[PDB]
Nucleic acid binder design. Structure first.
Length: 178
RNA sequence: GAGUACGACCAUACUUGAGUGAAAACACCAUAUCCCGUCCGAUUUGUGAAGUUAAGCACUCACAGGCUCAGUUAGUACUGAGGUCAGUGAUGACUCGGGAACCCUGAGUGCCGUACUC
């Protein structure tokens, strides 16, 4: 659906102080809806790993990362999430999508359904397209068969929003009402 | 480079145990006629100058105790603002900010002022 998350590369740094005349510059990959969320997830991680605040803070860069050619790949979205009971569970969750930013979006849609975890209770680590022979689960590995050939059964062919109707004529493509 | 008298901050100066100490000064020390005060010339007061750095004082030395100062603990605990957040609830996370403490580890262990003197 051209996914709802974007791959931001937020580069930042503490500040030129007089204690620290030249501070360390940090790189950070984040999947965010926009860059305002993406800068704040960066300063969340500068606080909980480096004791750096955003007040004493520089964002040197926050730019999107363009995707790739659209090719069906296998992605290991090594992902972690917080629940109140059994906090900070980390899973691996191999997926099957055309892009890297869409693979993380699928991870956010089934960390939400299988486990009921929301955006801010999820951290995403090391998204990489892996080959076919490294896929471990057979529910993703079944698509590497070179001769798949399934039928589209049990469909919901709806009309095209310009010719939809309410009462059609039972064996006929008419429209008695609408 | 030190002494003595008055000192300011009042342990980075304290406590314990060793070591060393030029000069000069402090100090133990000698003493009881007067001044004076005691159960007691012990303290205290007077008057001294034979003796000694033994002790005080000073300095130096401890995988010393303490103290002082950073660091770690730790963006942890906690907390200001927010939600028709999650959870039966207890409570928890998130969001915008602030942000500890002991343990532990490293360092070093008085500093400045006036007058007189070696």
């Amino acid at each position: 659906v051209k996914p709802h998350l974007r791959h931001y590369q937020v580069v930042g740094r503490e500040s030129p102080s007089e204690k620290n005349p030249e501070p360390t510059v940090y790189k950070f990959e984040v999947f965010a809806p926009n860059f305002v969320v993406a800068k704040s997830r960066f300063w969340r991680m500068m606080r909980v790993k480096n004791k750096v605040k955003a007040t004493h803070g520089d964002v040197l860069s926050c730019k999107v990362v363009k995707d790739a050619k659209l090719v069906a790949r296998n992605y290991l979205v090594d992902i972690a999430y917080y629940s109140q009971r059994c906090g900070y569970t980390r899973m691996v969750k191999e997926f099957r999508d055309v892009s890297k930013t869409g693979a993380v979006s699928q991870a956010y849609h089934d960390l939400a359904s299988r486990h009921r975890a929301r955006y801010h209770n999820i951290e995403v680590l090391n998204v990489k397209s892996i080959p076919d022979h490294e896929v471990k689960h057979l529910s993703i590995a079944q698509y590497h068969a070179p001769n798949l050939s399934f039928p589209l059964l049990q469909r919901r062919i709806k009309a095209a929003r310009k010719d939809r109707a309410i009462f059609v004529k039972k064996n006929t493509k008419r429209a008695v009402v609408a």
